[PDB]
Design a protein around this ligand. Structure first.
Ligand SMILES: *[C@@H]1O[C@H](CO)[C@@H](O)[C@H](O)[C@H]1NC(C)=O
Lengths: 320, 171, 170, 174, 320, 301
């Protein structure tokens, strides 16, 4: 007799999936929700190029370490496992991580001269302030973005220098304080046994006496420099007053607002490419909801998971 | 299965039906072949599609630079940050894998339910005019030609017409 | 139609039954009617109210001031705090909506199952003394008065009584 | 029940069948007794075993140095620690309770299903050679001896064989 | 004759969502998410909040002239802009830690620990006011602080103590004046060298003044720094000053409740009750979720980004 | 006489009760408990290695060498609730909690005399804590001292010292001979100059610590007011360990998992016992009961 049967699809698919009551169930159709593929290289992010600090690190970069060049904007900031050139002179960077967090969000960044080299310091010495910790082509040198002030004649007179903010945004400013290894040196440089420094915006107010001592030489300097920074609002005023022991700003930075950025640590080299998602391991091109690649991502990215596989069954059980 | 159709009383699938998930295979006086019922298949695809799309939509993320730096006197809050990132990681992985398993099960159950639904639709349609063999097959007590079969498939099947022709053969 | 009842071989619902979720319609010499089945309906009310009641129960808050204040040098931990609140918020949103979808599906399928099961109850009670016309209607090989209908619905219906009658009429 | 067998049209379980979750009780002139279908049972055992195992296998350990101490000027980040811990704990408790709830329901439905399947399998083997009285039972319109019984049970049931005596004792009623 | 089986249907326009199907009309549904709030700032559990007006926490504690002040509260409120501040250019140490301390508490009795008159025979308790911090265009100052000055030209070293014989913690707040010049220092506290020393069972510190003039706010360039300590029962807090100390008058005895909070709200207060209160308004509901506000005090629903959460009770609508 | 065949399901005496979504308190033929409440109420070893029980002293008292105390490695560190620093004097411990969080990260822990008792201090007198020496004047004199250390191991070295603030000038001279005095110490990670703040609230001693990286040198220079390191601690890393606070007693036994309450042997995914645990073991939950249904609905008749 004539027959009519009802039945279902089967095919050559060996693709296996997982359910709660049974493991490795071969099914007719499925999708993979997990991207295990990355492009193996650092890329541009949504057009913008990153900023690769190279041997220089954030500190060396903002302080104008001679080994860097000493530009303006970035999608994200990249440091290599070893970023050699540090803070040049042995010393301490105060609230470093905070600062790195402040740059962590921004792309705006106009470096200007807040205290123009020649004009600003009539009674003190601009050019004599080098050190053996900071080579420039083998010579004895210093940072680009800071001016180290010293005796002129035997005179190191009081200085009040004031920058009131005419820009439209926050201005990041750096300076430094020198604590000599000898009262000798102190009187060889700043001429005043007792000296003070102090600085105020409405935000920041502080005063330093040099604390004199020699703790073991780092880069053969037992003296120390402590590097400081602050953000001055617009229409506010930063004021420095020193009878000695002050490394003044030269180029200070102005930061404006677009809301994103970040920092990456990778030895992965920068290639020519573009991606909407970037990890220190490599870049990512996927539409997928999940990624096992790296926990650190930038841009529009899939969620990170410890999963070996995530596979969603679409079709039915496969029974040929 | 749960609805006992797939890997059920219907033992296996047909490599020979390429046009859809669910369907029929028939023997006739005009000959035989596999053909898929595209309405139930299509609904299945609507559902599965909305399931996957829903899955993907149900996770979308908010903005952070995962880069953060602490010094050697900051160790505590460093380990706290770590505890955060890791805890969240575990939570999400768990959510993912669980969702996947549960929706795979629900999906297979879904296909099964659909096939069973179809078979009951047809059975209910035919009534006594045909006999139920199993393997989801019917043997007609009368002559069901192309038009007849396709009438079953669009659900327009006419019992009254074949009532007697069936009766006589049911003897 | 996971169980194939609602929008299933039963094509649609009756706007005219206000008395409950699942019930009967009927015809005899004494006329027609829509009478909602009680037991099953109330059982479903119990199941579902326990479903939502439970869903609500399952969420336990702790006494909370989430808010904290961080000065301009606290930016990092300000961001860590933010990351916490946002992560948690994300996850609870996920749980909320996901739960809603899943339990929605299970609910509707639940109704389907109860419908079908009520039907099969009727059918398996009646046997051949009636036949299945389709759209979940039974046609009676015998005559059914209101005490007959009532005997069906209350679950007491007697086959061997109308046995012979139906057998002949059939 | 969802599939309407357990606490369904089969209104009770059998304390008398100890050899499995699902099975048959039979009657005939070679004697009666309880049996369990070892295939359906064993399958369900596999499914549930795997459910459990995959539940306990879905937790991979996150280890740390947890113990943390804060001074009296540390109060804010201390309360941040409290927030993190409490929040994680709430989420995990939630996921647990929810998991056991759902999966419990699904398990019961699973059993109900399996039972139904066994039943409709038997019934669809038999057809009209017997009558379903309800309560998951069948009355044989013909004589079903041991071999016939085990023939239904193992799926080999021959309809044509007893078809005649079935139609005889049947249509005598019909 | 006939018997049909079917399901309830109605005119209900309610649609829910499901993984397999979207916008599904159904007979009965419940909204689990609260979109509805009181729209105003209300009471809590019968008892009240504490609303400082244009003053901020700093003001309320120091007793800023424009603050009224008292007793108790369920929770505290500080308006979107709470200005009336430190009215003397300066800095508050550990402001947020203090705020956090208050953030859980209720009872809180403000008393005079070192009564103005009798405590300082040898110092001038009257000349404690500045132009920057006015009252009605005249001069004013904080009511909880006595600014000690020269008696004639003299400024005796003072040692004052307070033992805490209460059962609570006691909050004691003081200040340190950094002058805009020596002229002020010796003109005022009269001792070129001045030192403040504060000793408790926890707090021990010695502030020598740092003189210099940085930017003027509030019209003037002077400086002042506020500090605070919680002193435990059976504990002595000790002050010693040869100058520069701005001194405690009122201290605050603290009864600790494990719950409370601080809300920053522009919203206008009112007479009500409620068990759940938010910056945008109050809340009445049993609904487990709300999209109203992330910040809530009292016993409240989870905050969610969800616009709508609709759970299906009844079945699929198929009216015909 | 109709020759029946029936289909049915199991039931038994089992009272196990489990909760589903739409119905609660369901009796089921079989179930499994996923929530472990059981522990041995002992402090045991962990994956082999024993813990370190600080006894009467707490971390500070331990590191500073409280004599009521008195080895190299641990699985985890244990403090009593009765634990205390062995002080002595009113002073404070600087960045104490951080120091602790650091100790949580270590494992091996060689200790050594950085500044030998006899040899090191010929010009001064020794005035208590074992790991430090309190230096005062010899006869009339407290000469200026400079002492250095270089790292001869491949590990960080924890160096702890202390600073005295006499309550009066008289004390100052009676001890250190110098009314005007400084102490200062620098490694390359560190510099500080402490000068005495003389006041009453006898005497007061503040304690500080630092880690000298391998090869780096640390320097102490004092005209007075110095409690010097005797022993310093060379420490090579684990990335983990942990600090438990428990009054429970330590026994002979092993555990994959330890809690301050006691330890656990369980394969269960969930534990409500203690929020604090170490090793590989269940997620912590506020649940009173999690019981998963295995078998089916029990309907004995
Ligand atoms: C000893 O403990 C007390 C409080 O228990 C603390 O104030 C003091 O700083 C501690 N001393 C040391 C050396 O840790």
């Amino acid at each position: 007799g004539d027959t009519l049967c009802i039945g279902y699809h089967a095919n050559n698919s060996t693709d296996t999936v997982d359910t709660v009551l049974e493991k490795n169930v071969t099914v007719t159709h499925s999708v993979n929700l997990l991207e295990d593929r990355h492009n193996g290289k650092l890329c541009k992010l949504r057009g913008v190029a990153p900023l690769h600090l190279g041997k220089c690190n954030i500190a060396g970069w903002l302080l104008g370490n001679p080994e860097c060049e000493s530009a303006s904007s970035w999608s994200y900031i990249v440091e290599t496992s070893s970023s050699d050139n540090g803070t040049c002179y042995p010393g301490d960077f105060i609230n470093y991580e905070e600062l790195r967090e402040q740059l962590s969000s921004v792309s705006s960044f106009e470096r200007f001269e807040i205290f123009p080299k020649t004009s600003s310091w009539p009674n003190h010495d601009t050019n004599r302030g080098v050190t053996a910790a900071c080579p420039y082509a083998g010579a004895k040198s210093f940072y680009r973005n800071l001016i180290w002030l010293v005796k002129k004649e035997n005179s190191y007179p009081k200085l009040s220098k004031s920058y009131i903010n005419n820009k439209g945004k926050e201005v990041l400013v750096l300076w430094g304080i020198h604590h000599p290894s000898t009262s000798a040196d102190q009187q060889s440089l700043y001429q005043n046994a007792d000296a003070y420094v102090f600085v105020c915006s409405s935000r920041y107010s502080k005063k330093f006496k040099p604390e004199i001592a020699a703790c073991p030489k780092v880069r053969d300097q037992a003296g120390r420099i402590n590097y400081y920074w602050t953000l001055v609002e617009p229409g506010d005023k930063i004021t420095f007053e020193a009878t000695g022991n002050l490394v003044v700003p030269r180029y200070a930075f102005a930061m404006e607002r677009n809301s994103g950025s970040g920092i990456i640590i990778s030895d992965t080299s920068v290639h020519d490419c573009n991606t909407t998602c970037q990890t220190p391991k490599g870049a990512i091109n996927t539409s997928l909801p999940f990624q096992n690649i790296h926990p650190v991502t930038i841009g529009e990215c899939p969620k990170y998971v410890k999963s070996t596989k995530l596979r969603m069954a679409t079709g039915l059980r496969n029974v040929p | 299965g749960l609805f006992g159709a797939i890997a059920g009383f219907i033992e296996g699938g047909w490599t020979g039906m390429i046009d859809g998930w669910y369907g029929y295979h028939h023997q006739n006086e005009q000959g035989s072949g596999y053909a898929a019922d595209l309405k139930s298949t299509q609904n299945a695809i609507d559902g599965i599609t909305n399931k996957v799309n829903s899955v993907i939509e149900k996770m979308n993320t908010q903005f952070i630079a995962v880069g953060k730096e602490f010094n050697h006197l900051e160790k505590r809050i460093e380990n706290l940050n770590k505890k955060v990132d890791d805890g969240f990681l575990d939570i999400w992985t768990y959510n993912a894998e669980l969702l996947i398993l549960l929706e795979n099960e629900r999906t297979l159950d879904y296909h099964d339910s659909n096939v069973k639904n179809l078979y009951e639709k047809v059975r209910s349609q035919l009534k006594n005019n045909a006999r139920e063999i199993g393997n989801g097959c019917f043997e007609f007590y009368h002559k069901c030609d192309d038009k007849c079969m396709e009438s079953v498939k669009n659900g327009t099947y006419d019992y009254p017409k074949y009532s007697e022709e069936a009766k006589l053969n049911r003897e």
